[PDB]
From Swiss-Prot, chain A:
Coiled coil: none annotated. This is Complement component C7. C-, N- and O-glycosylated. O-glycosylated with core 1 or possibly core 8 glycans. Belongs to the complement C6/C7/C8/C9 family. It is found in: Secreted; Target cell membrane. Monomer or dimer; as a C5b-7 complex it can also form multimeric rosettes. Component of the membrane attack complex (MAC), composed of complement C5b, C6, C7, C8A, C8B, C8G and multiple copies of the pore-forming subunit C9. It comes from the Eukaryota. Component of the membrane attack complex (MAC), a multiprotein complex activated by the complement cascade, which inserts into a target cell membrane and forms a pore, leading to target cell membrane rupture and cell lysis. The MAC is initiated by proteolytic cleavage of C5 into complement C5b in response to the classical, alternative, lectin and GZMK complement pathways. The complement pathways consist in a cascade of proteins that leads to phagocytosis and breakdown of pathogens and signaling that strengthens the adaptive immune system. C7 serves as a membrane anchor. It is linked to Complement component 7 deficiency: A rare defect of the complement classical pathway associated with susceptibility to severe recurrent infections, predominantly by Neisseria gonorrhoeae or Neisseria meningitidis. The gene is C7. The chain holds residues 410 to 457 of 843 of the full protein.
Swiss-Prot record, chain B:
InterPro entries: C8A_B_C6_EGF-like, LDL_receptor-like_sf, LDLR_class-A_CS, LDrepeatLR_classA_rpt, MAC_perforin, MACPF, MACPF_CS, TSP1_rpt. It comes from Homo sapiens. This is Complement component C8 beta chain. It holds the Pfam family Ldl_recept_a. GO terms for molecular function: protein-containing complex binding. The gene is C8B.
Swiss-Prot record, chain C:
Keywords: Cleavage on pair of basic residues, Complement alternate pathway, Complement pathway, Cytolysis, Disease variant, Disulfide bond, EGF-like domain, Glycoprotein, Immunity, Innate immunity, Membrane, Membrane attack complex, Repeat, Secreted, Signal, Target cell membrane, Target membrane, Transmembrane, Transmembrane beta strand. Disulfide bonds join C9-C44, C20-C54, C23-C60, C66-C78, C72-C91, C85-C100, C104-C141, C395-C442, C397-C413, C400-C415, C417-C426, C449-C482, C460-C472. Belongs to the complement C6/C7/C8/C9 family. Glycans are attached at W14, N335, W440, W443, W446. Residues 64-100 form the LDL-receptor class A domain. Residues 8-61, 437-481 form the TSP type-1 domain. Component of the membrane attack complex (MAC), a multiprotein complex activated by the complement cascade, which inserts into a target cell membrane and forms a pore, leading to target cell membrane rupture and cell lysis. The MAC is initiated by proteolytic cleavage of C5 into complement C5b in response to the classical, alternative, lectin and GZMK complement pathways. The complement pathways consist in a cascade of proteins that leads to phagocytosis and breakdown of pathogens and signaling that strengthens the adaptive immune system. Membrane attack complex (MAC) assembly is inhibited by CD59, thereby protecting self-cells from damage during complement activation. CD59 acts by binding to the beta-haipins of C8 (C8A and C8B), forming an intermolecular beta-sheet that prevents incorporation of the multiple copies of C9 required for complete formation of the osmolytic pore. MAC assembly is also inhibited by clusterin (CLU) chaperones that inhibit polymerization of C9. Its main location: secreted. Residues 460-482 are annotated as: Disordered. The gene is C8A. Pfam families: EGF_C8A_B_C6, Ldl_recept_a, MACPF, TSP_1. This is Complement component C8 alpha chain. SMART domains: LDLa, MACPF, TSP1.
Length: 48, 487, 482
């Protein structure tokens, strides 16, 4: 395992925080947020 | 065997399409209407007929190769790839007349194992790689150093990540059930006088025993993960050349051959693995009856005596092993009937690193490859290909195939349906077995194509297929009826 | 057992000669394979097909037959222009490298490159002459990774036990669309046992006496073991085929008019079928089946006494290895063990077999070639095959005892019996209670026809099956377009 690992424990940042050096990145950051919020709104187990 | 074989039928032909402006040919096709089965005769005829044309409609087929035309293959390559010391054209054309060559890769670098195998599209319905769609020998500059263990590798331009993602599961179960019964019942009666006498006897036994042993052990080993890029893809030239040969007119047969040659969908994300499934299944039974009786009279005298004794013992046992990655020396010893000693298992998994199968995969429809930077009139070729892809799924989906005996599974390769037979039954339809009965798993007939627009419906039945005959398993895997908006 | 049906071989009277075709320089004629021998009787001195030298009625056609690009004058192949002086040998004359930089020959041809290019004979299960060109590359440098390459070496000079760089890559022939190198195996095992006994008595006495006893004991074992291993699988191309040069010339040498002989000869030389796709493997099957029984009975009365016993044991055992080394396939033939499987598997690295494949009838090859449509010839080739699969068919090889395989060796049938000498009465150790199937009698010729009716006919076998034996897949009539 010292020669072939995997990720075991994780601390997270929301994906939208990465958007950088693309056209309209400023807006795309918020839109990827609202899209993630809406993704979570589809995906949240509360529907089940 | 209870058979009369089904010979192939294709339909009567379509009308011709009008002549294509760019391919300068016209096409006619037939649907596969009934597959070859029970060794009934094939009628395949390579599923198509085509003819030349004399029409003069304008054509815009000259989508510009901006870089350099690969003289044999008809690929284009960007000008920084000429004289990179690598074959970007397929036929080494790009490296002709190099006033100098510049190398990039500082060391030898293996292809990741199976990376050229992942390069081919799948027929999603046979679940098979068909043929080559993306050029996994193309390196776009590349030469970035990647490592697995201490081995070093080159990543094909088409691939986002190949990484070990090195995960393993083992799941084991053992089960035993046993049950025993024994019953003994007797009678005795007597009389005497001074002359006469009488006697009677019965003794009995009934007995039973049962056992099962069931064992299942599965391991899934997942020591690479592949993801293909979403788009900006570089195509394998043999695919690219059938795509440049598709009509802009619609006539399903020429589009059908692309799915036959290059698959229905391209593999976009896959986990790459070895599997070692082992199952051992045993049912055992025993029974006995013993019975013994006498009768006597005395006055002169008479005796009667009887014995009846019986035994049965049986085992039915099945074992299956499937292994799907590794090297042939390990693979055969794992494939041996005995539960593998952990040394074998070690050397097998070590070789899975060098020859994986696909474990689980997410696929995209092949028309997302068809692109305006690669083909003229691309969007018409896409719309055509989307329609043909739907019609092709209706042909390749197994549902046409008459049901196998012995719970056999159809996969419908080419234009023949062949029933894969489980352990314990044999022959063309999987009829021939020593066993009394087998549970059957359900699948539908082919679904009704659509109802009218303004709300549209599809419907399915299981009339022969159904589980209840000889007490089968699950009937279902999806919705027994289906409906949608027209737009 | 039934008496033998041995007869001396007959060919037909000759047909009249074909005329002296230009470039071919030959007359041909044929005999119709009228009746090759049953399992006994002396062979035909003659043969089906004839060639004789003759001068032609007109001058031979020039290499303009290939059109706008080069053709190697002393052989068949019409070539795309880029192949001339590509640095690789594209035709049997080699003139495509005469009077002038591919390095791709660095990699050896893919394992199975030969047997997948060879044609095939559904009447005899044999290979045939090359149909595809097993070594044609079309200028392609198409390399394939060897998923089995891993093999150990040791180095005394530096203390490494490690896996060798040899065999890592193969050159794919242009005629293979893909050849995939994924490792798989699948094994399926059954065991079933049944074991029974019964024991019974009765007695009466009066003052006469009578006593009776019965015994039975029985055992059965069945097992089947199947394994398949695969090192790679492949599919041949279905458009722009490059034929074998031998196939190509042997095709151009065919008449535009329908005469059976030359098309029958190309069928016989290039095979009834061509392999469209296959899998490269080692298969081991093992099958082991046993029966035993023992019985007794006693009777006493007053007096006199009598007793009898009868018992049986029979074992069928098969071990068969396809693929592997000659040495280790002897090991795994002789013994099933954790020994014999592992080294057999190591030998499948080096010597695989095509284990399973799919195919098309030979005439379909032409439409998929670069030659352009040959429809008149293609229909003559089909029309001949539609007689050939009646005429050359192992169906005519007649009764085989003890489930023996009927096969036509060229002009003469064999019945390969699994025990004893071949032909009639293959058994003298087994009793007349032995079990053997009914299997097909041949197709008829195409029968006399009407606007909506034509027939061809079969029989499931001539006799019934031997004792409890199995039967054919079940047909009597098939129909045709008249
Ligand atoms: C192979 O030999 C081994 C060791 O002597 C023996 O245990 C085994 O039964 C043999 N198997 C076969 C198939 O003969
Ligand atoms: C297309 O298909 C029908 C069905 O056999 C034939 O009569 C003919 O080939 C038609 O053109
Ligand atoms: C018919 O229609 C659907 C398409 O959504 C098929 O997937 C299915 O076979 C159904 O019966
Ligand atoms: C071929 O066969 C005839 C009989 O048909 C003989 O007269 C002669 O052998 C000819 O060559
Ligand atoms: C009987 O069987 C062969 C094998 O299919 C056919 O090709 C032919 O019709 C023959 O008479
Ligand atoms: C009869 O012999 C076998 C058993 O069906 C087949 O391979 C073939 O169909 C032939 O007619
Ligand atoms: Ca280059
Ligand atoms: Ca050359």
């Amino acid at each position: 395992v010292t020669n072939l690992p995997q990720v075991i424990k994780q601390k997270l940042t929301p994906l939208y925080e990465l958007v950088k050096e693309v056209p309209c990145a400023s807006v795309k950051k918020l839109y990827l947020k609202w899209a993630l919020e809406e993704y979570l709104d589809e995906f949240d187990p509360c529907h089940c | 065997v209870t058979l009369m074989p089904i010979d192939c039928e294709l339909s009567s032909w379509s009308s011709w399409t009008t002549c294509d402006p760019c391919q300068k040919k016209r096409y006619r096709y037939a649907y596969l209407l009934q597959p070859s089965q029970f060794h009934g005769e094939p009628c395949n005829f390579s599923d198509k007929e085509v003819e030349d044309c004399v029409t003069n409609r304008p054509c815009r087929s000259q989508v510009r190769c901006e870089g350099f035309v690969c003289a044999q293959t008809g690929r284009c390559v960007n000008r920084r790839l000429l004289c990179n010391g690598d074959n970007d054209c397929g036929d080494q054309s790009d490296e002709a007349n190099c006033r100098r060559i510049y190398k990039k890769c500082q060391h030898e670098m293996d292809q990741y194992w199976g990376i050229g195998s992942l390069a081919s599209g799948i027929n999603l319905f046979t679940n098979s790689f068909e043929g080559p769609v993306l050029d996994h020998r193309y390196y776009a500059g590349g030469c970035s150093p990647h490592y697995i263990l201490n081995t070093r590798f080159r990543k094909p331009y088409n691939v986002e990540s190949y990484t070990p993602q090195t995960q393993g599961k083992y799941e084991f179960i053992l089960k035993e059930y046993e049950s025993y019964s024994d019953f003994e019942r007797n009678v005795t009666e007597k009389m005497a006088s001074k002359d006469r006498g009488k006697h009677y006897i019965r003794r009995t036994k009934r007995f039973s025993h049962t056992k099962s042993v069931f064992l299942h052990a599965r391991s899934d080993l997942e020591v690479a993960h592949y993801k293909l890029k979403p788009r900006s893809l570089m195509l394998h030239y043999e695919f690219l050349q059938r795509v440049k040969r598709l009509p802009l007119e619609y006539s399903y047969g020429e589009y059908r051959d692309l799915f036959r040659d290059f698959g229905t969908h391209y593999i976009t994300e896959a986990v790459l693995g070895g599997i070692y499934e082992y199952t051992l299944v045993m049912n055992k039974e025993a029974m006995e009856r013993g019975d013994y009786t006498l009768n006597n009279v005395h006055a002169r005298g008479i005796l009667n005596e009887i014995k009846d004794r019986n035994k049965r013992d049986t085992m039915v046992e099945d074992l299956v092993v499937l292994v799907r990655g590794g090297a042939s020396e390990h693979i055969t010893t794992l494939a041996y009937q005995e539960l593998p000693t952990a040394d074998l298992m070690q050397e097998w998994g070590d070789a899975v690193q060098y020859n994986p199968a696909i474990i689980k995969v997410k696929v995209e429809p092949l028309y997302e490859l068809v692109t305006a930077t690669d083909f003229a009139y691309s969007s018409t070729v896409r719309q055509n290909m989307k329609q043909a892809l739907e019609e092709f799924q209706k042909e390749v989906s197994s549902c046409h195939c008459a049901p196998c005996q012995g719970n056999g599974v159809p996969v419908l390769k080419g234009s023949r349906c062949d029933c894969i037979c489980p352990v314990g039954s044999q022959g063309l339809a999987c009829e021939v077995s020593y066993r009394k009965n087998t549970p059957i798993d359900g699948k539908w007939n082919c679904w009704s194509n659509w109802s009218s627009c303004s709300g549209r419906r599809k419907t399915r039945q299981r009339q022969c297929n159904n589980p209840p005959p000889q007490n089968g398993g699950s009937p279902c895997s999806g919705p027994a009826s289906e409906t949608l908006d027209c737009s | 057992a039934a008496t033998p049906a041995a007869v001396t071989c007959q060919l037909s009277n000759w047909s009249e000669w074909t005329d002296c075709f230009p470039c071919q320089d030959k007359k041909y004629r044929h005999r119709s394979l009228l009746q090759p021998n049953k399992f006994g009787g002396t062979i035909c001195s003659g043969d089906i097909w004839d060639q004789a030298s003759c001068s032609s009625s007109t001058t031979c056609v020039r290499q303009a037959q290939c059109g706008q690009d080069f053709q190697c004058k002393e052989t068949g192949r019409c070539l795309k222009r880029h192949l001339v002086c590509n640095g690789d040998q594209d035709c049997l004359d080699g003139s495509d490298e005469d009077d002038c930089d591919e390095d791709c020959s660095q990699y050896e041809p893919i394992p199975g490159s030969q047997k997948a290019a060879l044609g095939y004979n559904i009447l005899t299960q044999e290979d045939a002459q090359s149909v595809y060109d097993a070594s044609y590359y079309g200028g392609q440098c198409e390399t394939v990774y060897n998923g089995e390459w891993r093999e150990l070496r040791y180095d005394s000079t530096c203390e490494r036990l490690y896996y060798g760089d040899d065999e890592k890559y193969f050159r794919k022939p242009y005629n293979f669309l893909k050849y995939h190198f994924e490792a798989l195996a699948d094994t399926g095992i059954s065991s079933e046992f049944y074991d029974n006994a019964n024991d019974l008595l009765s007695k009466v006495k009066k003052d006469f006496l009578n006593e009776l006893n019965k015994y039975n004991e029985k055992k059965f074992i069945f097992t089947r073991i199947f394994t398949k291993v695969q090192t790679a699988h492949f599919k041949m191309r279905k458009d722009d085929i490059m034929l074998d040069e031998g196939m190509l010339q042997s095709l151009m040498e065919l008449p535009d008019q329908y005469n059976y002989g030359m098309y029958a000869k190309f069928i016989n030389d290039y095979g009834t079928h061509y392999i469209t796709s296959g899998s490269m493997g080692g298969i081991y099957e093992y099958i082991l089946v046993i029966d035993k029984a023992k019985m007794e009975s006693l009777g006493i009365t007053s007096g006199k006494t009598e007793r009898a016993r009868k018992a049986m044991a029979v074992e069928d055992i098969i071990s068969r290895v396809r693929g592997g080394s000659s040495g280790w396939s002897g090991g795994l033939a002789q013994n099933r063990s954790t020994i014999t499987y592992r080294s057999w598997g190591r030998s499948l690295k080096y010597n695989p077999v095509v284990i399973d494949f799919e195919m098309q009838p030979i005439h379909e090859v032409l439409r998929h070639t670069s030659l352009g449509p040959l429809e008149a010839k293609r229909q003559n080739l089909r029309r001949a095959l539609d007689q050939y699969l009646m005429e050359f068919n192992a169906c005519r090889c007649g009764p085989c005892f003890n489930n023996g395989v009927p096969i036509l060796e060229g002009t003469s049938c064999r019945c390969q019996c699994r025990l004893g000498s071949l032909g009639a009465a293959c058994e003298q150790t087994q009793t007349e209670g032995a079990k053997a199937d009914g299997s097909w009698s041949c197709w008829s010729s195409w029968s006399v026809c009407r606007a909506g009716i034509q027939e061809r006919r079969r029989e499931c076998d001539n006799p019934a099956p031997q004792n409890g034996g199995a039967s054919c897949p079940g047909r009597k009539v098939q129909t045709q377009a008249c």
